[PDB]
Amino acid sequence: ATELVQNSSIGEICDSPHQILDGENCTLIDALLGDPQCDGFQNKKWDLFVERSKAYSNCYPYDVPDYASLRSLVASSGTLEFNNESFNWNGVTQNGTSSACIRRSNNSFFSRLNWLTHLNFKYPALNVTMPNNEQFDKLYIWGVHHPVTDKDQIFLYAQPSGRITVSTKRSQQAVIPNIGFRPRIRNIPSRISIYWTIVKPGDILLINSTGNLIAPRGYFKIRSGKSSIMRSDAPIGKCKSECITPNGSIPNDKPFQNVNRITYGACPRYVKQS
């Protein structure tokens, strides 16, 4: 347990042979939703995406039930390819912006979300059908806004209470918004609940809802591969290594290792001591 144990790292992660994507100030979901600081990540691929502990959200605060599920789904696919679809939201106001989601010194919003408000103080029951006539699995990212006072629920949507229903052939999703003032993040007490819905080839996405809704602008392509995600603060260097740890790249010569349990690629097995 001495000569045959790899106990050191080079201090940095090799960008070869694996396609490495660095997060910088962005998380995977901040780049997924369309955080203005994360617009550079749109439609990029990766074999291993490294989130930094320095990452932060600089848009309009958002929460995600099953946050380790959605993060590991997008990570296992290894792509952010997004295709805009033409959802016909007739009777509403689109492209809603916020003062805490700034890009190019203007009020903006998530680039992959269409925050819908009333129109002419109308807001009818929106039933939008969207088929999946492809051969590959689609991923739709939608949201549910949580206004703080129904003073805003009336001002934004002109209904005392909303409700969101997302149905497919296999799945059905029902979410009711929660009116409530909350701790101000970037001077905002309101929140938005982000959910996800997968549709398979031949399946149809159904939206059976009035709109306290954060409508999607399209779908993400879903691939199946060895892609993954890792939390690390080690720099990225120009080198080649078939093993990556959050402490840096290590050689896979030894049959064992005590660098870190979290590994990626063809790596030795982890030992508890020495």
């Epitope: 979901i29 929460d63 995600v64 929660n178 909350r182 701790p183 929140r191």
Partner: antibody, heavy 126, light 106 residues
Framework: QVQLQESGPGLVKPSESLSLTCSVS??????????WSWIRQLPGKGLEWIGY???????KYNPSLNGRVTLSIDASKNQFSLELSSVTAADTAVYYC??????????????????WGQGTMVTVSG | DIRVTQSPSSLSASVGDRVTITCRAS??????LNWYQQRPGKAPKFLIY???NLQSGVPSRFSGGGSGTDFTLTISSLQPEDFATYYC???????FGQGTKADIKR
């Protein structure tokens, strides 16, 4: 706004069960996502969290106090009470009742103590 | 079991000085803590949320930062009305800090 006023005795003889009641005004005590808590003040120790309860009733308590704490909510009166059994001289303090929201969205943190009550002194000199 | 350490216990600074209070933890708590203010004879006040989000009654001179274990509360230009006792609470612990009350350099 949502006001909170603690009511109860200012003197409690030792070995007795301390009892205080917080009254919530301007809002519904029943809340879908909310906890109601109690916290005590001593000069030299600062603040010390005590208990915390949901509308359904869900409790966890400070392990420093060995289960001597028992809170309770009555939605018919918009009130929630504190009951501390077997009080000693180390239990004289200032007790506050506070409206708290919990969020845990990605950070898994988010125990927020929003509104705080005026306060009531209690003494154990007896 | 979570440990909290707040430093210093007390200090002194002039009007307009830049003072920093440190709240250290034994275990990593991510970007997760909050800072409060209780003035004498008053209940505490909800100042900062999630280590760096200022709240309703902030005068903009207050600020916080930090990640992991070492968090900092900073007052850019210390004002007289800032005289109070400051606490840091860690959530999953539900433990209050020891407290730091400082006063204006007289």
């Amino acid at each position: 706004q949502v006001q909170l006023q603690e009511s109860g005795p200012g003197l409690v003889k030792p070995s007795e069960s301390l009892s205080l009641t917080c009254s919530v005004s301007g809002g519904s005590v029943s809340s879908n996502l909310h906890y109601w808590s109690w916290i005590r003040q001593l000069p030299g120790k600062g603040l010390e969290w005590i208990g915390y309860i949901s509308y359904t009733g869900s409790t966890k308590y400070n392990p420093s106090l060995n289960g001597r704490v028992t809170l309770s909510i009555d939605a018919s009166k918009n009130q929630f009470s504190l009951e501390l059994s077997s009080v000693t001289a180390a239990d004289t303090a200032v007790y506050y009742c506070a409206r708290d929201f919990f969020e845990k969205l990605i950070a898994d943190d988010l125990n927020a103590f929003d509104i705080w009550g005026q306060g009531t002194m209690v003494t154990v000199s007896g | 079991d979570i440990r909290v350490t707040q430093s210093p216990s007390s200090l002194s600074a002039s009007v307009g000085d830049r003072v920093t209070i440190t709240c250290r933890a034994s275990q990593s708590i991510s970007r997760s803590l909050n800072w409060y203010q209780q003035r004498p004879g008053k209940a505490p006040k909800f100042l900062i949320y999630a280590a760096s989000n200022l709240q309703s009654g902030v005068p903009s001179r207050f600020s916080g930062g930090g990640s992991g274990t070492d968090f900092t509360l900073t007052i850019s230009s210390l004002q007289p009305e800032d005289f109070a006792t400051y606490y840091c609470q860690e959530t999953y612990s539900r433990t209050f800090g020891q407290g730091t009350k400082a006063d204006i350099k007289r």
